[PDB]
């Protein structure tokens, strides 16, 4: 029946899309967390150094009260200490995702429906599509879904790490442009 | 108040040597000068850059040579004089040189191989090697053969061969060649592919008079000369038919068909006025072009040759007057010279035809070999436009057939109404290389500041590149001065001599007055190539007899020889290569657009093909058209 | 033959080139007086004519120089000008001229002219008999020697003639080559014409077109049929591109003078206008010199803006006031465009980008504004506070992207910041509602190239009216949204939707300039410049055509692409078959395959301009009466015509008849022709004023005989108009032959000459002579048989010889009982004294076979031998005893032993 041919064409198109679009995109989004955490740590360190550094005239921080400087330094140090621990989780995840993407690309290379293009989903539809279809080239298709789910979990780990890092990242930037204006100790410590 | 000025070519050329002139009026001591070139779209690319020093020993005159490393392209040239920066925008032409296609035979037959040569030259006619693309096009316009050749050590000579297929349509084939760097410019030659058999004799038709007067009751006399290709005369029967033609008309005259016995290769036929009138008012025939078709058949009846001459003009005057070589502007209060050109109805120069003006009839100058006569008239200081008429005063001729031409001369637009005029005068003749031209410079200005002018800056323009630049010394009280300019082989075919001088007026304003003149020199080859028979005492060679050929030419010159049977030229001879065609093509490539002065200094500079930019504000109008205005 | 040079000793002149001396030489000899002389040795060609030599020199210092042509004259006391047509129709008798020219003062030359035997021509000359004539040439005279030749086979045949002078050591031989073409006509037909264009009405693979062999119904046998295939391109390029007048935007030039905000307001229009003209190259009509002033103003404004540079590399209207993020973003965006215009300092840009990154960075991809600009109209589209976090961040990201190229090595955090800003933009892209906000977000995200799938669908669907981006506000907002959309589409390389928006923008008739219009003008001009820069006319051709021909094992691959002048391609094939063409690539093309060959002559091939009547009759010196004239088939009387008559050898015209006819009206005869007969009058020319096209009112005249020569050459007649020789009608006449046509034996298109003796020879003949003549190399089959039945045909007599008994069988192993056909002329029957129902012994050559294997019809030529065998009861006569005994001895000898050869 033509339904089988249409399903086969759809599965081939989805496999090609996953091999050429999803695989490449997923890897590039996993190594950016390491480059952002280190960059923000460097920016926080630079901000701390500029505060009560070898010179002054640092906009409003120059006239900042002595008491507020201690609190600003303490909160900056706390944020810097908190953010450091997240680096290895993203560093290992990046290499794991790269290796898994290479393996998946190698596996993929080893191996009517046009109106359905509105689906625009190639996340975990391969195994299910094969499931409806069933109801030499078949064997490699079995582990592709498992590898893709493993990649999704690995990327979710890095996403969770980045989201957790935001909690400590946002506080330092707040107090920065809060004190950067004419805001006295009151509001600052009240919010801190 | 030192004033720094720069003179540049109007149009620059890629990978072509160019020269810029730097001058300074009222300057003291030595001054360094830096020159920079930038590309207009980006203004950052540095095509070339050079610097020098101007010293009073040379009266603050400098020449700097630059060459481009290589949607009209433009460049910006900036000169820094230490304290003043002057920048000018100059158009750049993509033309690189000239391509000449020489064909072994004018007409070819199927199967016969076609051998041709490509000669590549620069704007100076020197041999230049470059990549050239060549195409062969059939009459319908479908290129059959395409090639891309290059010349490095061939001295610009590229031979090529093509094989004509057995089945080829008959018509007019073309061979086109163009430089790779300039795809928009192509040189094309046209030849004939038509089935034919070589003849045994050549027939020529010669009219007794190059024209045909309307009132000539006798008619038109035509002599038919048929002679064997080897020189011997021909005897036979010739049929001659006359006809009229206003271009693409070809109206034959059945009543004019005549048959004559050509004896000893001589035959005369007469076309009566009555027959011409019947074929078609007597005055309505003006502008009609007569043509004659003659077919000669030998008494043996084995060979036939057809010869015809078309395009005999019908005019009421045996001569025509033109002012194409005369300036269209005059300086009030100064003598005015008209270079009147007298030509035959066909187009060839005249033969010592006197010319005179209605006013001041005492002037009577006979045309020289070149057919150009000098008419000098005193002009009043009036400012209104002048009107001048020129007639013909040929002796033994009535006033009915005399020529006529009226022209308007506009006043020279002096800047600031300072009535300052500079006039350049040169004797006109067929100049030859090595001759000396005693140019005359004359100055007319108020006596108040006559002691301020001390020199005139003069330049020579030829083939775009500035041939030479110099200064002519002037002293108080010397209104007229003589410059013995030298003419050498570097000249030819023609050149422009410009001369200018700058001064501060009553209001302390920098004003420059310039004048340009046209000089015509005899057209001749740069070198000297001669081919003749080595033997000095021998009879006509018999078939298959050894002979010695003597060729005289410049040392280290690439000489190419080709032998073409005379009978080939009898059928078709339109395609021919000669030095005259090359000189005409070179002249047509000149950037000038006026044979003399213009309206003001800026106009004179623009017409002469040079841009003159000063540091005070004076500048010439930008030119953005490769071809002259029509 | 006394004191006559033998034909063998005479060398014929064959080299007749139309052009030679195609040599290259260099002048390297020691120059003298600035002139170098070179001596060369050359061989003059055998052709007797005037040679023109043109020399062109190219010196390293002088240049191109053309010398005057040099004329060389080649002369001989006596010569021949052999005139032949370029081509002769096969199986069509033609006439050629051998005119002998002499230029002696008072010497009369008795010349002998001979034509060599050519197997490809059926001429009077034979192997044993030589066709030669004797003529007398007076001093300084030309005498014509016409010759009639019948071509047999096509190709580059050669005709050789020779002339010898009596009592002198003068001899001249002329050999000339002519291309004999098979009878037919130059006709061509269009085999096929198709359009090659994939990706339209084609197929998922590659289009294939099969061209079968052409009709060639009337193709002459064994004739070449060359097939030419022409590939033509159609690079159409016309989309109605429209620019904006450069003279109408002169108001956009403003001198930069202000306290930051005003200075930027003034400078932005000037810099954007300069960029627009630079991209479009409109300075020609806008003023080349004004560019210098514009650049000066731009640099002055840039220096003025730098004057207000903060210590932290920030930009603010007032130094004391805190910097504004939007103001510095606009500053860097403006400076990024003007990098190539002025000598900008990369250090300032690097410091500005570093300050922008370090102030607040992007912890999540959000930009915050703390110092609103004093001028509230500068923001323009950003005035609305709805989803400002989208428009502001997108604009700042675009500004960073413009300056990324310049300052990239100094700061390596730009890519990470860009990725964070993107991730934020796509975090909640589904919430955008305003058209301007959607357009700016899409343009910002299009530079990276990660706004696809549902994002692209949402961006496209936002286009209201399918051709515009409109919002309920000022025209400035709509113009900015349209510019953003145009830039985004241009970046996305979606050309199917650009022309409409560009057309609307051009039709908007908005130039801007004034208050609150800097952003709109800047963006519209930038978008227009980008469109002009990146707008290739049509899709560049990429056709790859493969031609497969059965004759050619290897396929012919051709590439047609734009910007290469390859749109015109031609190919030729010598064989016409059912070939195939496969197209490929992107582009448009057309194929035209046309076959050229030689069609059949049909029957309309004739003079087509005159109907010729020629006749010869005996007297009422033979003194025959010859009539020649012509009729015109047109609607009006023809012009002057010329009739050329070539009389048979030994025949001359009648002087009295010519003299009487000379005075006749409408007819003229040259005086030189009238006084003749001193040597011969073979050639005669008559000039007719006109020929009647309605009635045949013509004349006849007497011809006399003075010299009797066997095998008289048939007389020839030609007529042609004075103004045209192609329309010449020719005819042949002969007293004996039916129409003066040489006899020949032809089947289908294969013809062979028949101008030969009916038999070798017949008396003193003995047994030895018979044995000698019967042992020739060609003797293959000898048959003694009784001829009984004879058949008559329209061309030649046919004899059906019945095999009574076979004596010797040659190549054809024919047994007793079969019958063979012999084709011989009826006249030859009397020569061979053949009698019906009588015994005869005949033997012939092996190359005389006529017909196919089954049809071995024989031809009795000059080499075939036939002898009469007396009847069995006829040998009893006394006079026949010797002949019968000799025949019996000859038959017995050959049968037992046979000829040794």
Author numbering:
A (entry chain C): 35 to 145, 203 to 226, 256 to 312
B (entry chain A): 23 to 92, 102 to 311, 315 to 664
C (entry chain B): 752 to 1371, 1381 to 1522, 1525 to 1663
Provide excerpts from the study.
The ISG65:C3 complex could be reconstructed to a reported FSC0.143 of 3.58 Å, while ISG65:C3b was reconstructed to FSC0.143 of 3.59 Å. However, the local resolution range across the reconstructions varies significantly, especially for ISG65:C3b. The local resolution in the CUB and TED region varies between 4 and 5.5 Å, while at the interface and in the remainder of ISG65, it ranges from 5 to beyond 10 Å. The higher variance in local resolution across the ISG65:C3b reconstruction is likely caused by increased flexibility of the extended domains CUB and TED relative to the MG-ring. C3b could be modelled except for the flexible regions Asn93-Gly101, Gln312-Leu314, Pro665-Ala667, Ser749-Leu751, Glu1372-Ala1380, and Ser1523-Asp1524. Minor rearrangements of the TED and the CUB domain, especially in residues Gln1161-Pro1287, can be observed in C3b and may be caused by ISG65 binding. The lack of near-atomic resolution in ISG65 of the ISG65:C3b reconstruction prevented us from drawing conclusions about the details of the binding interface. However, the superposition of the atomic model of ISG65 with its counterpart in the C3 complex suggests an identical interface with TED. In addition, the electron density corresponding to the head domain of ISG65 also suggests contacts with the CUB domain of C3b. Should this interaction occur in a physiological context, the second attachment point could restrict the free movement of the TED.
In this work, we report the identification and characterisation of invariant surface glycoprotein 65 (ISG65) from T. b. gambiense as a receptor for C3 and its activation products in human-infective bloodstream forms. We show that only convertases of the AP but not of the CP/LP can form on the surface of T. b. gambiense and that ISG65 is capable of specifically inhibiting the activity of the AP C5 convertase in vitro. ISG65 adopts a three-helix bundle fold (Helix 1, Lys36-Lys84; Helix 2, Asp100-Asn144; Helix 4, Thr259-Glu300) with a 20° curvature along its longest axis. The TED of C3 is the main site of interaction with ISG65, whereby its helix bundle follows the curvature of the globular TED.
